[PDB]
């Protein structure tokens with residue numbers, strides 16, 4: 001096993017408090033909360049309770065309740081069914097590190113569990129609808145994957161070592177897990193092909209509906225099906241500066257002391273050129 | 274707060290009856306039903322009970338039950354988790370008016386809550402899969418939105434007034450909310466860009482998968498990514514007639530007395546040309 | 547009524563055992579399990595219990611539990627909310643036969659209930675995100691379908707027989723239900739138009755995001771919006787051999803005795819040319 005998003009938060013911030021469950025629990029959540037005292041949330045006080053909304057619909061009910069004016073996000077509450085949500089600290093998602101202020105949808109965390117990704121960067125914004133799938137094998141008479149359920153030991157072996165010896169890397173085998181940089185935007189209905197992409201450059205923008213079939217260089221704004229660059233983010237000199245200064249690894253104080261360097265693209269250039 | 278779809282229906286049609294809950298309640302639903310007598314649905318009689326299916330899967334179970342032969346849609350039953358469903362009367366959806374016989378999916382109601390839309394017309398058919406998102410800011414060194422969580426008062430102010438002064442209207446700021454006309458069809462996997470669209474013309478057809486990036490004139494059938502017209506609905510003289518006669522604002526009696534004007538496009542033209 | 551996926555499995559494999567419910571039941575599931583003894587799963591033994599995970603999230607919890615090491619898929623457990631999941635035997639899905647090792651998502655089973663499909667083949671792999679919708683009527687002044695809710699008997703009749711007399715087959719009327727062959731791959735965000743497609747050839751590959759608007763001949767690899775062939779699977783002589791040998795109708799013993807005929811495309815050709 002390994003820790004879920006909620007478990008990681010509770011480790012940090014629960015601080016011996018009781019867990020006030022806001023919503024109908026699921027068996028998975030009840031396994032998580034088994035070591036703690038917990039109860040169906042009634043009257044709640046952040047000094048004594050940490051509130052776990054089960055679903056995002058359960059969260060909206062809580063935040064509409066006057067009782068939640070005192071609760072601070074992450075420190076005092078969290079949604080349980082939200083493994084790919086943003087956090088103010090670096091977290092883990094099935095041995096995939098993801099930085100701060102970084103969210104994604106069920107498709108991506110799904111890809112994380114499969115191991116299609118090695119890391120997601122900082123301040124990265126991925127739409128819920130986006131999907132990341134590998135490709136099936138093209139070298140054989142079949143493309144069905146679940147035919148593998150019918151194979152014995154002997155058929156499994158001969159099938160499983162033909163996949164390992166493949167250039168086009170089916171099922172994301174034989175390749176490095178994908179790497180998604182910081183300050184990336186991925187739009188709705190998008191697709192990144194895990195069998196052929198190894199890295200998405202920092203600050204790259206994927207237009208919505210676009211279908212990425214190969215690595216996107218840093219700051220390449222890409223649309224259309226498949227994905228070709230229509231515009232770059234900034235000048236190539238500005239690109240190479242951002243990759244050394246690494247403002248996304250900054251502290252919070254460094255963000256609020258160099259605000260207007262971030263707000264103005266070329267005001268930044270004077271300071272870190 | 275403001276009234277949900279269910280609350281609006283119950284106001285109209287509950288008429289002092291008890292609410293028979295068909296399904297496992299959610300905390301959000303239980304907040305809604307708090308003022309009324311309600312119970313886990315067992316034997317139900319529309320003379321005494323109004324049946325609220327919690328989920329759409331709960332609804333199918335009810336409609337398969339022989340007990341539901343006597344219940345009429347809206348008047349006697351409704352799904353709770355169905356904020357974007359059709360209704361025989363004009364309704365509200367987060368201060369967004371939507372006409373009669375008009376449905377949409379979770380993406381659109383999501384856009385409604387954000388305020389990306391000003392109104393949805395009558396007899397409008399929007400696929401569940403469709404999504405409506407704004408664009409992030411392109412004028413800065415970053416595109417991440419949730420970096421805003423790290424800003425203090427002072428950083429928030431300088432960041433928030435640069436957005437207000439923007440031509441491309443990021444986050445749907447500084448622009449009129451979108452307006453969706455009557456008799457519109459939007460297909461599956463579609464996308465309308467809330468940062469750049471202000472109005473979708475009445476009777477416009479969005480082909481599925483199409484990505485609308487700018488206003489669609491009335492009756493423009495549009496496909497492809499992005500969205501360009503491949504065909505118009507009717508002749509331009511027929512277009513300008515429909516915009517004055519406004520058959521979608523008709524009564525029910527006017528629909529059933531002028532049936533074959535609606536069924537035949539050019540039979541309509543003789544009456545209202 | 548007709549039998550769901552779970553009911554069909556339980557008929558085959560329950561064998562007088564008790565149903566151990568792993569998760570929060572739904573009213574629909576509780577209707578299914580009404581004839582059997584069943585209980586909230588605690589300590590479970592496949593000799594005495596069949597475990598029904600309600601949701602797929604409930605399933606992952608079960609499979610992470612050490613108690614599930616003894617349970618075999620289908621024979622001893624199954625997800626309830628998974629009507630379009632793979633099975634080792636041919637099954638039914640709303641009078642739509644689907645072969646072995648064949649899965650699809652909520653869109654397709656949705657299309658099945660509508661009757662847009664006549665059969666799904668063997669070893670067919672359809673992404674969850676794929677959608678299958680018919681087209682609305684284009685012959686009239688309106689495209690809204692739910693305006694039909696406002697029609698009386700008389701308006702319904704004149705409206706319903708104009709649809710039956712249509713070349714473009716709106717609402718999948720007047721046409722054969724769609725047929726999906728064996729060994730088909732359909733990718734994410736895809737769309738097959740039920741109003742214009744009658745058959746997808748065996749072994750056809752639909753690239754993800756592609757929008758199929760007309761029949762795909764066997765083994766045509768198709769991408770882009772709309773869907774045009776960029777490559778065929780195998781040589782046209784190999785195509786016509788696979789359609790007679792029909793390896794997807796094989797037994798399991800025939801799969802494991804002719805493994806390397808399936809793994810190697812042209813090694814197959816020597817045996818069955």
Ligand SMILES: NC[C@@H]1O[C@H](O[C@H]2[C@@H](O)[C@H](O[C@@H]3[C@@H](O)[C@H](N)C[C@H](N)[C@H]3O[C@H]3O[C@H](CN)[C@@H](O)[C@H](O)[C@H]3N)O[C@@H]2CO)[C@H](N)[C@@H](O)[C@@H]1O
Pocket residue numbers: 085086103125127128129379380383384386387406407408409418419444
């Ligand atoms: N507020 C509407 C809510 O949105 C939900 O999720 C969708 C979307 O809104 C939601 O928004 C995501 C959240 O996830 C995540 N927790 C924080 C992130 N900043 C936010 O960002 C997203 O929505 C922001 C609106 N602040 C937009 O500014 C931003 O453009 C967009 N990327 O992510 C989903 C993407 O598709 C549900 N769709 C809807 O039912 C619900 O009501």
Ligand SMILES: NC[C@@H]1O[C@H](O[C@H]2[C@@H](O)[C@H](O[C@@H]3[C@@H](O)[C@H](N)C[C@H](N)[C@H]3O[C@H]3O[C@H](CN)[C@@H](O)[C@H](O)[C@H]3N)O[C@@H]2CO)[C@H](N)[C@@H](O)[C@@H]1O
Pocket residue numbers: 358359376398400401402652653656657659660679680681682691692717
């Ligand atoms: N009947 C199948 C059901 O469909 C559900 O939702 C999908 C679709 O079917 C459903 O259908 C919508 C409903 O929403 C809404 N309440 C009324 C509207 N007339 C209807 O319309 C939609 O389905 C009609 C089939 N009358 C089609 O005639 C019409 O082309 C299509 N726009 O909207 C969703 C769009 O994607 C679930 N996908 C599936 O699980 C369920 O079983």
Ligand SMILES: NC[C@@H]1O[C@H](O[C@H]2[C@@H](O)[C@H](O[C@@H]3[C@@H](O)[C@H](N)C[C@H](N)[C@H]3O[C@H]3O[C@H](CN)[C@@H](O)[C@H](O)[C@H]3N)O[C@@H]2CO)[C@H](N)[C@@H](O)[C@@H]1O
Pocket residue numbers: 106107110111113114133134135136145146171631632649671673674675
């Ligand atoms: N393992 C991740 C899980 O995936 C889920 O569903 C998605 C996907 O993964 C899932 O996978 C389907 C299953 O359905 C179905 N029961 C068996 C089938 N062999 C499998 O196949 C799919 O995932 C396989 C990963 N073996 C891939 O090898 C294969 O390329 C892909 N078609 O189908 C969905 C397609 O979109 C959820 N998205 C996620 O929450 C969950 O955690």
